[PDB]
Amino acid sequence: SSVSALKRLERSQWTDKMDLRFGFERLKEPGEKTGWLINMHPTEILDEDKRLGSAVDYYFIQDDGSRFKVALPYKPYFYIATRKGCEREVSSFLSKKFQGKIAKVETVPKEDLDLPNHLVGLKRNYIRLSFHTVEDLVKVRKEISPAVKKNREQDDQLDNIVDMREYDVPYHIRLSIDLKIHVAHWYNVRYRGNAFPVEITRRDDLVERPDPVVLAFAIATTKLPLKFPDAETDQIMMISYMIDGQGYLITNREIVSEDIEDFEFTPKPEYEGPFCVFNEPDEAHLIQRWFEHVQETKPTIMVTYNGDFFDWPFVEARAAVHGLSMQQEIGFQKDSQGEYKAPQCIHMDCLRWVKRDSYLPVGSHNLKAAAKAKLGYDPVELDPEDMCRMATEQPQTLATYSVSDAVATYYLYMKYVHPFIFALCTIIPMEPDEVLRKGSGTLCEALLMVQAFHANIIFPNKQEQEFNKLTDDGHVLDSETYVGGHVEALESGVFRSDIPCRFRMNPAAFDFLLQRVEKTLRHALEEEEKVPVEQVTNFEEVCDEIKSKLASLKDVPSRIECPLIYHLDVGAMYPNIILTNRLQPSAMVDEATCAACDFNKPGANCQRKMAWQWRGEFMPASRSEYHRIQHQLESEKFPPLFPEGPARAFHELSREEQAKYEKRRLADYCRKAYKKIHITKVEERLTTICQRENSFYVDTVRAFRDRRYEFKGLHKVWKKKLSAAVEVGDAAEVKRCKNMEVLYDSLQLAHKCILNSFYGYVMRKGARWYSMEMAGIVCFTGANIITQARELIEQIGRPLELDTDGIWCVPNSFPENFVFKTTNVKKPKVTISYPGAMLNIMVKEGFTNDQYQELAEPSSLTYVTRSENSIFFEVDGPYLAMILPASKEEGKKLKKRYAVFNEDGSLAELKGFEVKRRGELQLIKIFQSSVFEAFLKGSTLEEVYGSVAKVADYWLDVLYSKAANMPDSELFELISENRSMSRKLEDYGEQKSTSISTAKRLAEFLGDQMVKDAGLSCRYIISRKPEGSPVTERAIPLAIFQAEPTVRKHFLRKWLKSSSLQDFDIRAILDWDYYIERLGSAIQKIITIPAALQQVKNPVPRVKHPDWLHKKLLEKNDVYKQKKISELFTLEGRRQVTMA
Amino acid sequence: MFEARLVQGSILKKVLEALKDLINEACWDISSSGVNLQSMDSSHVSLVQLTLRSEGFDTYRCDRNLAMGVNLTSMSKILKCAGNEDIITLRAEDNADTLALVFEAPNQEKVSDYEMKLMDLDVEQLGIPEQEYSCVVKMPSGEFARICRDLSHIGDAVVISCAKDGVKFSASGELGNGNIKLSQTSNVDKEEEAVTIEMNEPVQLTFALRYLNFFTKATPLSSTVTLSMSADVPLVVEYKIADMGHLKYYLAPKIEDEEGS
Amino acid sequence: MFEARLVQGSILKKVLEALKDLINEACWDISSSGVNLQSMDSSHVSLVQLTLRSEGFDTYRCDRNLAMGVNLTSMSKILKCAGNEDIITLRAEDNADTLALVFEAPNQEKVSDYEMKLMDLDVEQLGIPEQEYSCVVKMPSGEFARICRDLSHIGDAVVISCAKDGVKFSASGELGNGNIKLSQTSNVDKEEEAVTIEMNEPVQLTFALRYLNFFTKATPLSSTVTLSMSADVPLVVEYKIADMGHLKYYLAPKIEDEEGS
Amino acid sequence: MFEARLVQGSILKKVLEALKDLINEACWDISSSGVNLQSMDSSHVSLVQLTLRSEGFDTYRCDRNLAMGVNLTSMSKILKCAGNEDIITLRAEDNADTLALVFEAPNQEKVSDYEMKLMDLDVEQLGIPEQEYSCVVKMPSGEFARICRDLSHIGDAVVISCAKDGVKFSASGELGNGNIKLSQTSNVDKEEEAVTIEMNEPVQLTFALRYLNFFTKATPLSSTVTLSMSADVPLVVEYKIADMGHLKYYLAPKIEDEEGS
DNA sequence: AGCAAGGTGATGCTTTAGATTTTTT
DNA sequence: TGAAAAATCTAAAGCATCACCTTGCT
Ligand code: SF4
């Protein structure tokens, strides 16, 4: 008790001292200051009672440069629920038994969201209880929780407590929920003294953000060859860090060769780094120089790239070896989750944002690719293998590498993640670093807690996963999910606006799209442009123009015409569906509690019956079987799970291990008792959305959509103002408008990310607002929209690909866009898209919710019904080209792989072709990079294929000629496979892999030193001489080819299992068949199979089609067309054969 | 109510396993002329018309026409639960859901009673006109089944040509191509082995072959079969179940597409 | 150091193949009286007793009692080497964890000497009770195999009705329902196909039929099968291994007492 | 031009059934002495040869020395057309990719023709040495197939020991280890059933086992197999027919390398 | 002398946890 | 080289499906 309290006080005093030494002076005078919030940290303070007290320390920076720090105490609390009639008795008992532990307890009437008949205004009297410390919170929560769990499983005064809420809410989160203190806002802080609490108020008059002191650092180490840099055997050889655009660089003189002078790095004119260099003799002096310079500069933001796992720990280890610890001199520690965070400065690494919010493909998360994509320049390339050699030959290239990595991480912080994270966290109530760490689900949960505290409801607990729940007919479900939509390629090949395509159309859809043209244009003008249809001049002209186009297209339903590659993408389809259908996590209701309210009247327009599709896997055992196997299980005692205890009683082991044991013991019974072991049922369910539910979720999503729209508008206005500013060329207004423009761009980006995260939050396992029903409903409504669009474009053209978000689809005579002259002075011209408008009226007829009820006033419980449909399509222009490859696998595991080329000839988009950083040959990567730019040559289809097969011809000519005209170094740079070893080689046991084989070859080549520590890097080729042995067993390494000749000859004698060969050159022993096989597979994926599926002869004759192609082409896409009985034989008619 | 009696029960098992493979939706129709089946497959390519008349059964009585919508997705197995030569009795009730099947062993010891349930299915009906025939080729069933299984490995499309020399069955594909020519019999007197042909004009035409593979599950049903084709006329395969009943398989033809003209 | 040799070797293959798929881990009780094998499945439902008395062996040599832990997959795969009518021999050491099996061809030319390792096994013994049964029936094994394979896909569980008129095999499922009735056969001169029924009172039992399909696998072992059952009594499916031994499958009847959801 | 006529066409089907699982495309050459197939398998471990000589065929007509490469994956499955008595006409043209087959049943009515598409082949020729073998054993092929199939499940390798007592096989694996003894019988009147030996010194060898299982599918081709082996030589296994010639396999032994040393 | 049919060998489509294909050098 | 941090991969385990000639015998 006392020992923990004194340790907590010691930690608080140390954090206060460390805060003071970097400028964050604790506010100890009565007065008022203004500030900008930079961080917030749950601490302990002392009050006038000199007792335990929890608080939050808010750090502010002022515009003049000075910084301060204030502490505000607020007692954390949670909520209990008890049965009616004994609330006061439970309150009195809980006060008198937790004597000196509960600060205050009181009954709060708060509105349940899941309560039956809660829409009239029923409210439940919860009990708030608050504690002085977070540790007291945790202890009392742990003491109450067994009683709550026992009561909630069976259905003293602890039996009266039936339910318990708000226990996983963090403390600083709780403060930012209550007092509405989000960071990156300006505040007045008024400190009267220790008696009255501090007063903090928001200031909306100042909008301009200040500039905090930021330090971006990177290190270059000493690396043992073919081994990852270890902390205990190496040392830092140089460190480079930027502060506010000023460079600094410290080099270790015991490792480097000659001195380096002050120099500038400038990749682009907008990126300027002047680096001044200090040259410390030994590594301890390097650490002392870095620590002293950080202490002198006093930064409140420390940023790196993947520092938490590589940059930060290495420096901590080297500081701890050399005596002076890193925590006492800077402030960083590993904390608990492996996160290096300080109590005085926010630590950010750009890798978390690159993974989460950059929307970069997987495999492009490295800082080289991320800086090429975002910043627009490629940094300098230097492989770490020959990096230790640069410490001696010349250190100029290594200095350039380190300063380049520092510039990259600094400007990737300053340009992208700084305004994004400090605009995202004005919304989410977390800390800036906390927003950076965790996934979007917890951000969305925190936001919904803001909006649900504003609505005065209580927060549902996190979704505890039930283990093996029994479905409605009694079977034990070992898998339960919703049928989500997938991607499928309806046609594979090249589709270019120049090459004509064959269109087979029906004219029934042309009658569908002829008399409805006037309604099409009226609907497209009514709310999509908000233009009344009376002030137009050429309405009848454009209507008769569409009639003439569709009548010219009418008489020829089958034609050969040029395509118009469109991307009908619905504009954030899933939040639009949630807004349209009013899907809330408590809106899905069942008749057991839907009938218990007072609005289930005859003729009530309140329900919405919406269908979804459910997917379950379950054992084929009934209720009686599962009950009897439980009764057989309870007749015997469980074995000890671990050898640190005796056999387990029924209250001893936990739920998950007994659930796994029951799963196994039912599986090995139904293996021999029933034919099937896992029955999969994909059924069609239907649930009722309550359309007059408490609307905090829906108006949160709608307010965020509206705020995204208004921030996009402000961003466009300020972008125009910025263009005018850089045209006139002033100084103050240019920087002011640049600051405003980046503020609004960051805010709309944050709103877009949150809008995308709302859909992903509900399906998250363990989410507070968890809904499998919403996931199924939104996926089925999205799939229904994609299906009806598939029918609508499939009848008038060819849908190339069906994605989960939209349709890539396709005639040259089809109407594209039309301009309307309007008498309005604000919009003289209106540009409208007919393919967008026809889908708009299709979803207007189909998915418009005509029963969308909103509470107009809460006095007489009056609900207004309205017709709302915000689901709109978007046409992404007539793209020049689209290339779809073909894959062996068809189903839900198909990958979204295609390449779409803009009209100007660039790369509009490219998906699925993510080249792996080391897991692929260089041959495959260069072949792909050439073939994609090669598709756009030629005029007709055969010229396209014969000009895109030149890449395959060239590389098959290189590999068929044994690379006889190839230099040796690039032959190894192209052929070789790089690969890693994640953990210990010997711990795997005796299992076969090519990494295992080459690791064993390297171990027997040069000692056990290459296996002594993990993280081995292996570069290997595959040889042909040991015929018969598998692919793994022929993985000779590459370190042999640079070694002395005698050991190379000895181990090539040994490994090839031969002692009679003469030539030991690389061309002689190389397994060319493997490389031909994999390059031919890539050719088949990209060039050959799409040419076969387009009635085109094989462009590369050396690569042969697979047999499944030769059966699929005959069974699906033949030159002929199979007939039907009804075409060539008489029909008697349709009759209904009912049961007699 | 309807009664059917059959002394040796192999042939009903054989026709039902013939109808198993290609048919999922079936509609038995009973009238004064016997039992009839007019069924269209779910793939919308082929057709089947089966008929067992009144005099084939031993004891038979039909009050009026009744339609039963059986489902041959999983139905022939309950008949597959029987022996070979067992006496089979069908009992159809006026409005009850149970079709009764009685199986009697030849030693009058092993009896068996089965019931069949019915439900509601929808079907398109196609009336069969009678028209001047043209290309008839009568063959043994075993030879036709063997040649169909033979050509099944070559490709999925079959070429049928009748000419003065005889008849020719062919297929083609990536593996290659294969033709087989059969001429008329001259110096043989046994009826079940000889082949014969009726011709009006030499005809070259194409059909599908997987559906013919589904047609050839009637090898022990009868020793005789006839193939019947004509220009722009669906190929009908006729099995004559002794002097007891008959069965028609209709298959849609396959011609070239004159897209350019 | 157990040594036994028998002139016939097919019956060991038949017994072991019958015991192959049903049980995996088995405890072979070895004593002077013969070979005993009582065990259960991993599902703890099907029980097997197997007795091979010493008077049927050709040459026998025993030392004392032995506890054995053989998994039956091992020898069930080994004994595919034994011929149609070869000489079988099993050999065990006094204190070794291996078993030797010796196969002699009838012409004394092909000699096969296999041996195999072991694993320690623990089995909870369950001795059967001796009580008088009501329904004891002796049937041919082939027709029992036929009717079980017929009813296997008809439903899941069978209902057996025993009365003085005979036995009734009823089943109901998604395909409908059906029953097979077998009566007494007295007018017969031979016994190996003669069905006979012995009765105390009419009974109505229900059994899960997957376990009957597992029990059916002993069809070539014996030409007759004896089913013994009463109310709340496990089914006893007894086969007689020649005049020397007997194999009994005990099956807990499936009660399926639903609680009305 | 190349013409061949064969009336015992089942042996070619047996050859392709034996070789369908080992090599996917092989090499044939035609000369005045007949057809030879001397090819390396896919894993490049051992040599196989067919010797289909001139007078073994019923009618042979060859014009010049030639070599062709025929994929087994198509011709093996198209030779499934025949039963056990059909007769085969084979033609290989001079400069035509198509290879022609005609197929006559013995009923003098059935005639068929097929065409094959060929591909180029580049396989290095390995020289054929004639070396003496110390131990030659000649045993019926049925027991050879049985012993290989019965040692198939023991492990991945086999041990052969030829000693003055006779021949011993051995195998080992996780389920156990077993050896097999074969002696000599010299009091039988059938040479096809008789085993015989000739020995110079005892032989100890180790060999692949599943690969011998793969080459024990040529058992219906011939009733007697001869095995010849000695120290540090490939084992020769041959099936010789009383009328037709010999099928021969050279199998290289295992590496026999001490991994520790 | 081939049928009932199925059964173990092959083959193709889910699936679900953690290593790996991912960061840092 | 440690890592769950974190959500996208992906490869071993999973399970459904095809396939014909081999144990009794008509
Ligand atoms: S849908 Fe209507 S009846 Fe159902 S809970 Fe909502 S208001 Fe009540």
Numbering used by the authors:
A (entry chain A): 27 to 181, 213 to 867, 869 to 1198
B (entry chain D), C (entry chain B), D (entry chain C): 1 to 261
Question: What do the authors report?
Answer:
In a wild-type Polε, the mismatch would have been cleaved in this state, but because we used the mutant Polε exo− in this study there is no cleavage. There are three separated primer bases in the exo channel, similar to previous studies on B-family DNA Pols. A total of six bp are melted from the primer 3′-end in the editing state of the holoenzyme, the longest unwound stretch observed to date in any proofreading study. Unexpectedly, the template strand is scrunched by 2 to 3 nucleotides, such that the frame-shifted and melted template and primer form two mismatched base pairs (P-2:dT with T0:dT, P-3:dT with T-1:dG) and two serendipitously correct base pairs (P-4:dT with T-2:dA and P-6:dT with T-3:dA). Therefore, the P-2 and P-3 bases in the exo channel are protected by the out-of-register base pairing, allowing only the mismatched primer 3′-end to be cleaved. The structure of the mismatch-editing state reveals that the β-hairpin is too short to interact with the template and to keep it separated from the primer. We therefore suggest that the uniquely short β-hairpin loop underlies the out-of-register base-(mis)pairing in the T/P. Importantly, it is Phe-285 of the exo domain TCL that stabilizes the T0:dT via a π–π interaction to keep the template strand separated from the primer 3′-end.
The high accuracy is achieved by their 3′-5′ exonuclease activity, which correct errors when they are made by the DNA polymerase (pol). Polε-core interacts with the ring-shaped PCNA sliding clamp to assemble the holoenzyme.
